[PDB]
Write a protein that binds this ligand. Structure first.
Ligand SMILES: [Zn+2]
Ligand SMILES: [Zn+2]
Lengths: 372, 372
């Protein structure tokens, strides 16, 4: 098996379907990656994650470096061994969660120092340390460490963080290449920045292509801009990236965001789905429902009428309504398994429709029903 | 399949091993029943409960009557259908949890009225209503509704509650027999009371045998008396019950309590295992451990070195330590699956040793290692 081979089997418009072959397995694209936070995909055994159809999961570097610790995971044999998932794992860089979750952050050209949200202990990330942590975890796809740009951003601030991010992309590339075992067995993705600005997006794409990566994320989106703007930025941004490498839209998203992003050339996705009753949200082909709603208390139908998942085979809305209202762990288990299965079924339908040259029709039909 | 047939295949001293055949399946005895509270065995799918070796689970009437409601469960097809467990279910009467968990209880010869601990709504239980709720749930083994005696109890108070409980046992018997579908398909167990007093235990056994039940619980124990006293009371109490019916020790218990209770003629057990870090307790053949302890943070061995469960096949102490410390749902899932599997392996070893005429040796060996 190669370290990394992305092959495009079929195209329709800007959409593509294909495979990434890696040492630990094949990833079918477009792909949805369930998110493992602290070395677990919430409420699911790895076998259950695989049973939903997932080919790859995401691990959060920030959480892992705090608990149990990167060096500790390495001592124990790496993240795959530790958590019992033997297929590919993509790790993020840790940078975003430092900005969103940690306190007392000091930022400079060298990286960021910060206080853990768990115990106030002091930590550091930098391009070099982020790549090192991802090496210690043993992940298969490594994300370059960048500097996030908040939305909204002025052109000056967006340029500055894009420029810094490109300097850090080169540092990430060299750090990754400096470690033989990592360079030979893992892949490295760069992240395009530039906020909503076409010229900065172009400069960033050119800088990243000059350095050269195995894949390219469109960074800096899904941070408050809303779908119309996100799509507008994707419209000009994705074509700037190398066509022959995967395009990853980090942290996206709701089913309709995924479909529209695939229409715009995105191949990979991840997101986590719980505040204010939101743990009760279940995806259906007729749109989301909140299973906590009293209207489900006696509803004997499955979460979704067509879903092939094990939860829909075995349990009713009424039961899952009860479990979630009662705060039972099994409620979280069942809801998560169904929702991730639903996402994987969505991705399968997207892949099949692109392969069959009927993705535009699929997208129209999907929207007409999902938003009816 | 018969409604109920208890057969004793082998004996050693006061210990017995055998089977209860019921319409929904066979229960191997001595049996451990995992506890389903609000229509779920915590953190486990029913298939996983079965995979541990469980033949029957317990459902808590008090919790079920409050949420989702007994009538609602009946409308939805009964508890087995609702939660997806198709084997036997024993339901308790609800009386104990009314006393332990509810507020504003008023007690009389007719039953008990009480305020729900969930929302302060007013409810009632009585022999008749308890039997009716257990009918609406569709359980296979129904417990007579009794009046619990706190420990310690004076002889007068223990006699009064025993006498009331025997009157309520007769009411429970007649209520159960009044409902054709229940009488034909389910079994009814009576509960011996009398606190620590031999004469009251004898009167209670005689009253229950006169009424006639399918099985007999030794009630009123594991309520603070400690193991020596519990065993002392079992020593004289169990032989008073009909030999040819199952003997159930409700809410017991720790592995050593189970072994000693089987030595004294008990055939059935249940208990729930979480306060003050106790969710971290894992059973091993070398005694319990608390997986939260820092000594496990890098321990690559499974929870128990010999356990056949799926958790011990796949994950280390170090990983489960991390999950529990991190408050992850998967930690609760794995710990519960291992602990219930451990209990079922204990019961299998007990059954096999009695069948092979070497239970006394097994008990000695078990204790010498478990308490080393
Ligand atoms: Zn489903
Ligand atoms: Zn185990």
């Amino acid at each position: 098996r190669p370290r990394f081979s992305f092959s495009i089997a079929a195209r329709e418009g800007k959409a593509r379907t294909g495979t990434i072959e890696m040492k630990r397995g094949v990833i079918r694209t477009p792909a949805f990656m369930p998110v493992g936070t602290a070395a677990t995909v919430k409420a699911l055994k790895p076998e259950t994650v695989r049973a939903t159809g997932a080919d790859i999961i995401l691990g959060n570097t920030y959480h892992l470096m705090l608990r149990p610790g990167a060096e500790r995971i390495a001592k124990l044999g790496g993240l795959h061994s530790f958590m019992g998932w033997d297929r590919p794992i993509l790790t993020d860089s840790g940078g975003y969660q430092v900005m969103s979750l940690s306190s007392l952050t000091k930022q400079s050209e060298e990286g960021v120092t910060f206080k853990s949200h768990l115990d106030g202990s002091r930590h550091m990330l930098s391009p070099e340390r982020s790549i090192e942590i991802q090496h210690l975890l043993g992940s298969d796809i490594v994300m370059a460490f960048d500097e996030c740009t908040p939305y909204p951003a002025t052109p000056s601030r967006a340029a500055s963080s894009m420029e810094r991010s490109m300097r850090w992309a080169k540092r990430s590339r060299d750090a990754f290449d400096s470690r033989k075992e990592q360079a030979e067995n893992a892949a490295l993705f760069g992240i395009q920045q530039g906020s909503v600005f076409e010229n900065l997006r172009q400069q960033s794409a050119d800088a990243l292509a000059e350095i050269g990566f195995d894949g390219y994320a469109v960074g800096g989106l899904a941070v408050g801009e809303g779908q119309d703007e996100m799509f507008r930025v994707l419209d000009f941004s994705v074509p700037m990236l190398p066509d022959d490498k995967p395009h990853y839209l980090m942290g996206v998203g709701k089913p309709d965001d995924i479909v529209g992003a695939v229409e715009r050339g995105i191949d990979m996705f991840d997101c986590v789905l719980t505040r204010s009753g939101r743990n009760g949200q279940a995806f259906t082909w007729d749109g989301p429902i909140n299973i906590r709603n009293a209207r489900f208390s006696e509803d004997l139908k499955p979460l979704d009428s067509e879903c092939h998942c094990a939860v829909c085979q075995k349990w009713s809305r009424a039961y899952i309504h009860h479990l979630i209202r009662a705060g039972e762990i099994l409620g979280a288990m069942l809801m998560t398994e169904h929702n991730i299965a639903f996402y994987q079924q969505l991705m399968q339908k997207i892949r099949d429709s692109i392969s069959e040259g009927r993705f535009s029709q699929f997208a129209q039909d999907f929207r007409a029903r999902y938003f009816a």
